[PDB]
Amino acid sequence: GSMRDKLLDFIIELSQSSKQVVSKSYVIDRLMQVTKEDY
Amino acid sequence: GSMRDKLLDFIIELSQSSKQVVSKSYVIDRLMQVTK
């Protein structure tokens, strides 16, 4: 659902960039946003 | 559930790596595997 859509949007964000390497800290930050829940 | 677990696993893997930048194609491939 929502998490999967957020994951796909992050994949699109990576795919649309011309960069060949990306900041690891940025990837981690974004994935923590993708997985964030409310408890 | 499982998608969250798999992404947490990937976050932990990245966190244990000494790399500061990583292959974008590698990240995309790993994340695409999770979308299945």
**Calpha distance A24→A5 (Å, rounded):** 22
Alpha-carbon torsion, ordered B26, B12, A24, A7, to 10 deg:
60
CA B31 to CA A31: how far, in whole Å?
10
Interhelix angle for B2-16 vs A2-16, to 10°? 40
* 3-state DSSP of chain B: CHHHHHHHHHHHHHHHCCCCEEEHHHHHHHHHHHCC
- CA torsion B34-A4-B20-B10 (nearest 10°) is -40
Assess if residue A39 is contained within a domain: no
Q: How far is CA B27 from CA A8, A34, B22, in A?
A: 12, 14, 8
Instruction: Give the SS3 label for residue A4.
Output: helix
Question: What's the total number of domains in chain A?
Answer: 1
Q: Which domain holds residue A29?
A: 2-34
- Find the helix or strand (DSSP H, E) in which A23 lies: strand A21-23
Residues of chain B contacting residue A35, judged by C-beta atoms under 8 Å apart: 4, 7-8, 11
Distance between B4 CA and the closest CA of chain A, angstroms: 6
Q: Which of A7, A22, A31 sits opposite B24 (nearest CB)?
A: A22
Resolution value (Å, 1 decimal):
1.7
